[PDB]
Design a protein around this nucleic acid. Sequence first.
RNA 1: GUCGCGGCGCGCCGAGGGCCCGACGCCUGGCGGAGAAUCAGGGUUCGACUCCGGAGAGCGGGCCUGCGAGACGGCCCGCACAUCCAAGGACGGCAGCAGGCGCGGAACUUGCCCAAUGCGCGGCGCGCGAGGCAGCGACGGGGAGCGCGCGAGCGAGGCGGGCCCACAGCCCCCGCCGCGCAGCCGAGGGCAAGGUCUGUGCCAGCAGCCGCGGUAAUUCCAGCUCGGCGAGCGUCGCGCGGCGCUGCUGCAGUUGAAACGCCCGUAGUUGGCCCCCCGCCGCCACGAGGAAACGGGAGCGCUCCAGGCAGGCCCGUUGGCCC
Lengths: 176, 129, 62, 119, 139
Amino acid sequence: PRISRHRNSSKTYSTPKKPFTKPRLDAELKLCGEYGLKCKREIYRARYMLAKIRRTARNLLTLDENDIKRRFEGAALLRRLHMLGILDEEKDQLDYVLGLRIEDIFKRRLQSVIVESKLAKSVHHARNMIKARHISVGGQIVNIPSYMVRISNTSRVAIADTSSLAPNGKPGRTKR
Amino acid sequence: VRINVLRDALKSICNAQRIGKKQVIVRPSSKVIIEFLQLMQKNGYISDFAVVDNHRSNRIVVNLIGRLNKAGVISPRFDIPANDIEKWVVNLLPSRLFGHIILTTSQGIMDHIEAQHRQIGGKVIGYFY
Amino acid sequence: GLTSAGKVRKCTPKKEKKEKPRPPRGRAYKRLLYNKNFVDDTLIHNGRRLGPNNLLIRQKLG
Amino acid sequence: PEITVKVRKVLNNPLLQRQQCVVDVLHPGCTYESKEAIKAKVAQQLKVADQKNIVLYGFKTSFGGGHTVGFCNAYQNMDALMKYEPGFRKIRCGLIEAPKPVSRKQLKNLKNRRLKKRG
Amino acid sequence: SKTSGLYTARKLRTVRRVNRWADKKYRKAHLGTWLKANPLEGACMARGIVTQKIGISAKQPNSAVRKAVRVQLTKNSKKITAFVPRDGSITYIDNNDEVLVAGFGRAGRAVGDIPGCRFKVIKVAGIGLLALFLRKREK
RNA sequence: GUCGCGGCGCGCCGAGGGCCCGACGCCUGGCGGAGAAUCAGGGUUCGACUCCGGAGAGCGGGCCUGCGAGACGGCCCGCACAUCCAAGGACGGCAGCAGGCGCGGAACUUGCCCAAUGCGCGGCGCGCGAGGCAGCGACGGGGAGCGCGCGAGCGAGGCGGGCCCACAGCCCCCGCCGCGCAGCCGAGGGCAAGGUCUGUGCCAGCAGCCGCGGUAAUUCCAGCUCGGCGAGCGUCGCGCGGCGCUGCUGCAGUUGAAACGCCCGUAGUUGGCCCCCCGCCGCCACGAGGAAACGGGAGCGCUCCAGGCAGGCCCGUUGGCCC
């Protein structure tokens, strides 16, 4: 009854076991300073995505080589991590997936990519520009600062053609 | 009564090593004791061992090289599924790289690594690390 | 006893709230918390790091 | 600004005498002012040349993008269109006059009242 | 010592079932004497009409008059003693005016200097007690 | 006798049958499973609900029709409780969907519509409170805001068009005006954050716990400042983890809780060594065959995402494979 019931849903964040650890409160604030994050949930999501990927890597490393699952599932984890750019292209092994940080999840995010391309003066600048849809990846405008681009789309990231090139010519304050 | 022949043997070897005794004697000799010790001799943890014949259960004079750290038995011998071997190695042995778990298999008494290569599992006789 | 109830609450003289400016919200507030705590090294620094509500940090910032 | 129309996965359907096509409306920096405006270009690709015999539907704009993915039912003839078309989508074409259904509850109340008095 | 025989699973299963009861927590979770005894009867909270406003003394070494109301729960006609929390909050609660009572937070044990009050008022006459204290809604 | 087998029933004959590997009796705020919650591993707890099988339409019975119902949106009857009455009679059955009443801590609109997805009948098509759509709805899950910066920019709106739709609407696209906007709990310790200034003076209160309050209150009542998390945060109840405080992994018993006063002894559990080569067992591996969803998991940019099974001129494009 109601196909809505059959639609799935999941939690994408994992709160810390201890919430008031001073070393782990300060480090999260630094990781909000360099990445322009609104709330700690965004860092928790980053650790949930990394932990799952690391758990796949650890359950495959324990498995013997030439066991078919290690060859197939491991190649699919590596390919995904290479396509996103989380895994450096040169490493090409399962062990290097275990030795990764949430810095690699954050770097692929669009807000950090715009600063690297020098389009954004800061990460705080980029967040506002993406909310104002001034950024297009591969010809598609994005409004999400956690879009996370793939290595191929890195070059195709550009200022939205219809936004800051002034095709409108009367944008916001200029109009009036 | 003497329910486990192997437990008394590996205890009498560990006690001898702690004293620093080079050679020890095991009062009852079994075929499974010889197979467990043979595995330790092919792993370098033991030295030459000689089964004297008393015309009864037989004795074993075991030579040691200080190399063995711990030798024990899992009782009752629980049959281990192939995918369960690693879970046993993560608790019973220190380090995934060193140690040995000796399991009786249909192929024969073998270490966990040999069983993993043949992709079969079996009842655990004991462990030597 | 029950008749003398809430005696400190009635006794307390009503105190007026300061009309402070609206604070930055969301990412901007996080930026200011990061700025004060790690960057600058002036607001919480007496030549050494100090606690946010420290009496030395107060008076210096008012 | 210009509108360019490409049809993809055109399938002949002599069963219902129609051509099932996927119309792609690419309008970068501008908007197609209704399906009727771009009907001529899709009709040209089909070669039907009759805008009326084309039924455009499921037109979905993508977020930000000029691209709009839509579908066409290019019937061979108007007569076939009438025989095999959802009546509402013929009214939405503006091709047929609107028939008016009564309230479903009012229709079922009268049914029940008829049954109450000698079936 | 424990029993370790390949066929002694039945004994271990029986021993665990028998010795599980020694813990008070397993008994206060499965015996069911608690469910019948509790005036909340396993509910998150209950509703009930005020009968008496009582001044309860604090336990030593604390010397104070905690303020509470005796409440007969509509659900099981069972009179409980519930502390009314915060300062001057009792003035909001009249007699016979209906109160929603939840437990203190020790899962049915009396908490703090207050003795025997396992419950506290959360809503008076449909109005949250904390709101009447912060003066968000009037009585 | 039944559709048929059968103590199913009866007549007759015999005395069996089930049990500490728990029979039987009682009790269950007891539907079961696929599953779910929490979690290193081993585990624990819950299984009203989506799919599957069972059961029941106030409660007992009984029946007819049919291929199939012991059918309740069929009937007959007894009880309990309605309903109308011109007093003779008639007449029900929301554990369908709205909606009410009662009860409780707690739970949505007497909305619309057969257009999709099915099914009943019928080649040209209707019927459906199945199901779909809208409303309500901080159950919860997910994605963005509350500025960037130093002069430019949005989106929240509104208003139009388009799109969408059974009809609207939302989303999204496009013009036009344009109007960012935070709580809830804390600051003695646990546990992050004032040895600030009043009031109060074992009072009032606070405080899960330890503790503060009796005149220099780091604990109350306000102001101030500050921390945490965040469009959510606090409280209560309960499950899991915590808890090797239930111990299979993995607990303890000289003295902290705890070896039965002793001995025999059945059930139970446990039993040395020995034969390579054989049959039965358990055992391990690998197959068959048995619903998906779910949980993984291949591949695919719903703008990201939770999702979904899509897509794009493509393996016979897919949707593998596992449980």
